[PDB]
Amino acid sequence: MKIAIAGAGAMGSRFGLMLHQSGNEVLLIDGWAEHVQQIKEHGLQANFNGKEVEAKLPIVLQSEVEKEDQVDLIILFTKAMQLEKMLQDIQSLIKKDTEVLCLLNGIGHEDIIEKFVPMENIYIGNTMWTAGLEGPGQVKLFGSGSVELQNLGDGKEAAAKKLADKLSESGLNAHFSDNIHYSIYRKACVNGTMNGLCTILDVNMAELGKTSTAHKMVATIVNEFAKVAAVEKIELDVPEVIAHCESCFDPETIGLHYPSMYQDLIKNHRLTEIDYINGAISRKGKKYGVATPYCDFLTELVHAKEDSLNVK
Amino acid sequence: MKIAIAGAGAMGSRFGLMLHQSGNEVLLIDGWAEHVQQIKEHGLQANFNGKEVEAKLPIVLQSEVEDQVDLIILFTKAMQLEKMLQDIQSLIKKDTEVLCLLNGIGHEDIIEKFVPMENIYIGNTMWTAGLEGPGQVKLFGSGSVELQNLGDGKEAAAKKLADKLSESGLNAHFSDNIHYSIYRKACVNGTMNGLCTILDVNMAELGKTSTAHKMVATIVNEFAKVAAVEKIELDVPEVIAHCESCFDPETIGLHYPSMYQDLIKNHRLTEIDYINGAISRKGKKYGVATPYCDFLTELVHAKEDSLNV
Numbered sequence: 001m002k003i004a005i006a007g008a009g010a011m012g013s014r015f016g017l018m019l020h021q022s023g024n025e026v027l028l029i030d031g032w033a034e035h036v037q038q039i040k041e042h043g044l045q046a047n048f049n050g051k052e053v054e055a056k057l058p059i060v061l062q063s064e065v066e067k068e069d070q071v072d073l074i075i076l077f078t079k080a081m082q083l084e085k086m087l088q089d090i091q092s093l094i095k096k097d098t099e100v101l102c103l104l105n106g107i108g109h110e111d112i113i114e115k116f117v118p119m120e121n122i123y124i125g126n127t128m129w130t131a132g133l134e135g136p137g138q139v140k141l142f143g144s145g146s147v148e149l150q151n152l153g154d155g156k157e158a159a160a161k162k163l164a165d166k167l168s169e170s171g172l173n174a175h176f177s178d179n180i181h182y183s184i185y186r187k188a189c190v191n192g193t194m195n196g197l198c199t200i201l202d203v204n205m206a207e208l209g210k211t212s213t214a215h216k217m218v219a220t221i222v223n224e225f226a227k228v229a230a231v232e233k234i235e236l237d238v239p240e241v242i243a244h245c246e247s248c249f250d251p252e253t254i255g256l257h258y259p260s261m262y263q264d265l266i267k268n269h270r271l272t273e274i275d276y277i278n279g280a281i282s283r284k285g286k287k288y289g290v291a292t293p294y295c296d297f298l299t300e301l302v303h304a305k306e307d308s309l310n311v312k
Numbered sequence: 313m314k315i316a317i318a319g320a321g322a323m324g325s326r327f328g329l330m331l332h333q334s335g336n337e338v339l340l341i342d343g344w345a346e347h348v349q350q351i352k353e354h355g356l357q358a359n360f361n362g363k364e365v366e367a368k369l370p371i372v373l374q375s376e377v378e379d380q381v382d383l384i385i386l387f388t389k390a391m392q393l394e395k396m397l398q399d400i401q402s403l404i405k406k407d408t409e410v411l412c413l414l415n416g417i418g419h420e421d422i423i424e425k426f427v428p429m430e431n432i433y434i435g436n437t438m439w440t441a442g443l444e445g446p447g448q449v450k451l452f453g454s455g456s457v458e459l460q461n462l463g464d465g466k467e468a469a470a471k472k473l474a475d476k477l478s479e480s481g482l483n484a485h486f487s488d489n490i491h492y493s494i495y496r497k498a499c500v501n502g503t504m505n506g507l508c509t510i511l512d513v514n515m516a517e518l519g520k521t522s523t524a525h526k527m528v529a530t531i532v533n534e535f536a537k538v539a540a541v542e543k544i545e546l547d548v549p550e551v552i553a554h555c556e557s558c559f560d561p562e563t564i565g566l567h568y569p570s571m572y573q574d575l576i577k578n579h580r581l582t583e584i585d586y587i588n589g590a591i592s593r594k595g596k597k598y599g600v601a602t603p604y605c606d607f608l609t610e611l612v613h614a615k616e617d618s619l620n621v
């Protein structure tokens with residue numbers, strides 16, 4: 001099939017590369033002009049599991065997408081703050097039958113996606129794959145991963161399973177889930193603890209785990225996520241989710257890495273996705289009458305940090 | 313009168329120096345051996361408002377005290393206060409006034425283990441100081457002191473003590489509501505010190521951020537809820553404004569708070585357990601939610617652990 005990767009940064013480049021290596025036709029769509037020009041002239045370059053790889057993937061600036069152009073599957077992989085503008089720029093690509101899959105971190109992206117895409121064509125999930133964008137046209141891809149996804153449209157279960165199988169045929173290890181909202185919240189707890197705490201404390205995940213108060217901070221935040229999720233009839237298994245968060249402390253899994261939010265703000269001086277993670281829990285709390293002070297304070301701290309570095 | 317400065321770091325050095333320049337007899341007591349040695353050999357050196365100054369002040373290691381004084385001024389960091397009181401017990405006679413001007417809350421409790429209640433005076437100060445290295449301080453700006461007796465009937469003795477300090481330029485005032493005053497300064501220390509430390513900014517930089525006001529106000533409200541249980545009713549709007557006045561680059565805004573100097577610059581443990589930590593402890597005791605103070609205290613301890621302090 002024809003697959004467009006809308007947002008061809010670290011993760012988008014991974015998925016595009018893997019989907020291309022299995023014989024899919026892949027179009028990359030991106031908003032970073034220098035990145036697009038590099039890929040045009042020299043292809044996408046990857047340190048892929050140690051091996052230098054190059055692939056000439058077609059790429060277009062999101063503002064230059066052709067209303068004549070058309071794909072079967074759009075995979076969204078922008079950062080949360082770029083999602084709307086990306087959808088505005090590529091709407092003409094959204095035809096009757098086009099599947100649209102969102103695998104961004106954070107909560108609530110469906111609402112935005114539903115302004116541009118018919119409900120029956122929306123698939124959402126999250127992923128445990130990782131990736132790094134080293135500079136224009138350059139990515140570093142290590143580790144293993146998985147994808148979970150579910151259809152949001154009534155009667156699209158089989159189409160969702162098919163979509164997961166298709167991704168799995170390119171090595172993406174994708175699974176259909178019958179409770180994607182539970183799965184999104186659970187992963188959001190990980191992003192809601194590791195990302196902001198590492199960023200503010202200036203540590204990697206193993207270093208965070210070594211501190212005497214990490215467990216208390218993680219557990220308090222996870223409880224706040226769970227109280228908000230319960231209002232939406234999602235009952236998180238808090239002890240399992242706390243343990244799932246703390247498993248990131250292990251050097252043998254992902255502990256030696258810095259989370260994406262750290263790479264964004266501390267290393268690259270870019271705005272973070274905090275409003276969509278802890279911030280989403282704060283805004284829900286206010287609306288539901290649930291106290292979410294740690295999410296409020298962590299969000300505030302991260303914004304302050306962004307401001308202190310003069311980030312956008 | 314013979315004055316001992318128990319804890320002769322940045323602030324203890326200021327007070328000692330100013331008290332000595334007015335003709336008081338001053339003994340410094342400290343636990344930093346290298347600092348004590350430097351002062352013995354070369355005197356205490358200060359950049360004092362731009363003038364290089366040297367004063368040869370007697371100094372003794374706290375563990376080698378022997379040597380009576382009339383007034384002890386405590387100026388350790390909070391974490392060193394108990395050990396300091398243990399080491400200098402022999403100096404605390406039925407006579408001796410003991411004045412605590414440390415930042416933080418609740419130091420009377422520990423002082424009462426060593427000092428009779430009628431001899432305890434407490435307060436806080438708006439003076440500033442920097443310890444640049446052993447035997448070296450930098451002293452700029454203006455300041456003030458507020459203090460009150462804790463013992464019944466010691467009001468006049470407290471006023472006299474304030475006048476004495478004022479005679480050395482310390483701009484000290486008696487207060488009839490020292491607990492209000494301690495809480496109000498603790499709100500400053502409970503916002504600026506931890507937030508600057510965690511965010512790696514000076515006070516003016518903190519004030520320029522979009523969320524500083526919200527963080528300050530939430531914290532101040534937690535202090536006020538705890539203080540109200542103890543029948544202290546903070547004027548929350550005025551306290552918030554007093555905190556935010558630190559944001560002004562033309563007054564104190566260009567400075568890094570003491571906690572920042574401690575942990576980020578010098579890799580030393582902080583006073584967090586006696587500021588935001590004291591509000592958390594009280595919140596547990598009174599059933600009052602203090603989540604910002606809990607989280608800020610946790611974040612600072614995690615920061616300390618990450619720097620292996």
Ligand SMILES: NC(=O)c1ccc[n+]([C@@H]2O[C@H](COP(=O)([O-])OP(=O)(O)OC[C@H]3O[C@@H](n4cnc5c(N)ncnc54)[C@H](O)[C@@H]3O)[C@@H](O)[C@H]2O)c1
Pocket residue numbers: 007008009010011012030031032035077078079080082103104105106127128129130131132133260273
């Ligand atoms: N990277 C990871 O390991 C990881 C893991 C799981 C989920 N996620 C999630 O996947 C989504 C995408 O993350 P990502 O890491 O691929 O983001 P990314 O920042 O690498 O890319 C996002 C978009 O930003 C653009 N961009 C990147 N750097 C830029 C710069 N300097 N100037 C201009 N544009 C620039 C990219 O070209 C791309 O269009 C996010 O929601 C993220 O949280 C990421």
Ligand SMILES: NC(=O)c1ccc[n+]([C@@H]2O[C@H](COP(=O)([O-])OP(=O)(O)OC[C@H]3O[C@@H](n4cnc5c(N)ncnc54)[C@H](O)[C@@H]3O)[C@@H](O)[C@H]2O)c1
Pocket residue numbers: 319320321322323324342343344347387388389390392413414415416437438439440441442443570583
């Ligand atoms: N510095 C300020 O401007 C200021 C302003 C108002 C209140 N305060 C408060 O006054 C109290 C004392 O503060 P300070 O600034 O004078 O503390 P300080 O850290 O300058 O000195 C306190 C004690 O620690 C010792 N010390 C300092 N560095 C050391 C080292 N490297 N190794 C071993 N020992 C060392 C000092 O000799 C001193 O005895 C605190 O409660 C503080 O919060 C300080």
Ligand SMILES: O=C(O)C(=O)Nc1ccccc1
Pocket residue numbers: 105127128129130190191195248254258259260261
């Ligand atoms: O950093 C991120 O944004 C992210 O999702 N990291 C992550 C990936 C897989 C497992 C755990 C955390």
Ligand SMILES: O=C(O)C(=O)Nc1ccccc1
Pocket residue numbers: 415437438439440500501505558564568569570571
């Ligand atoms: O840094 C400190 O510990 C401190 O108390 N600073 C401060 C001084 C004077 C006025 C306001 C704050």
